[PDB]
Design a protein around this ligand. Structure first.
Ligand SMILES: [Zn+2]
Length: 257
């Protein structure tokens, strides 16, 4: 099955998922000089006050924090979006070394990691119907750099010891994802895909310009997770990023002058 190694990683994925070589694949390099300010962008609204997390899972690729999305709670709207999109999960991608780890890049610069807050368009009723639609998802992407600690990340870091291997999961309630957001909501936006198989082309990407800082100790704990399941040879969970894909016929729009 797919992964991030030599024989099953991103260069192989097109075999089982031919959309890998599609017209609106993610991530991409954000050329900041080529991105155009768009004054028609409405203000971005991130309303996470009533977010309710359910659990955290190691899926053998990364860890997912999954939210109860049964009520109208944790909504992203505005900016490039029409209508309302509801938070269902967040996930990270990171490196073996601080010099790499992010999926999107900014003028070719790789950040130490990247966080994705995944939301579905409530016009489509649930996540599974939404991913069948070209406007079904909005992913808020946030870069992480190594420096000062992020206090609001520490609850995630501490729970990782309990989900070390593939297939392990834990309850994970009352996690507030507002504690993972930088000060500025300045962003770039473009139409793209999920960055893991099945690579579906359903996503409006909204990538924040301002990174959050996390400490070296916090990201070292991410690197202690395992790809393998319990009782197979230990392969550390690192470098679970897909590299930048061709931009094709797309334009990246900036929300800021
Ligand atoms: Zn992701």
């Amino acid at each position: 099955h797919w992964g991030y190694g030599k024989h099953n990683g991103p260069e192989h994925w097109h075999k089982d998922f031919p959309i890998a070589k599609g017209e609106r694949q993610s991530p991409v390099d954000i050329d900041t000089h080529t991105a155009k300010y768009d004054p028609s962008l409405k203000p971005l609204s991130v309303s996470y006050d009533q977010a309710t997390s359910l659990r955290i899972l190691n899926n053998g690729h990364a860890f997912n924090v999954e939210f109860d999305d049964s009520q109208d709670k944790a909504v992203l709207k505005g900016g490039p979006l029409d209508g309302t999109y509801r938070l269902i999960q967040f996930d990270f991608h990171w490196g073996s070394l601080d010099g790499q780890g992010s999926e999107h890049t900014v003028d070719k610069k790789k950040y130490a990691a990247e966080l994705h807050l995944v939301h579905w368009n409530t016009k489509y009723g649930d996540f599974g119907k939404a991913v069948q639609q070209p406007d079904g998802l909005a992913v808020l992407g946030i870069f992480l750099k190594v420096g000062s600690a992020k206090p609001g990340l520490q609850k995630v870091v501490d729970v990782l010891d309990s989900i070390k291997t593939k297939g392990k999961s834990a309850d994970f309630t009352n996690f507030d994802p507002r504690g993972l957001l930088p000060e500025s909501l300045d962003y770039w936006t473009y139409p793209g895909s999920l960055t893991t198989p099945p690579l579906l082309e359903c996503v409006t990407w909204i990538v924040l310009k301002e990174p959050i800082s996390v400490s070296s100790e916090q990201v070292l704990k991410f690197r202690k997770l395992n790809f393998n399941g319990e009782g197979e040879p230990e392969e550390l969970m690192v470098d679970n990023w897909r590299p930048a894909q061709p931009l094709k016929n797309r334009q990246i729009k900036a929300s800021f002058k």
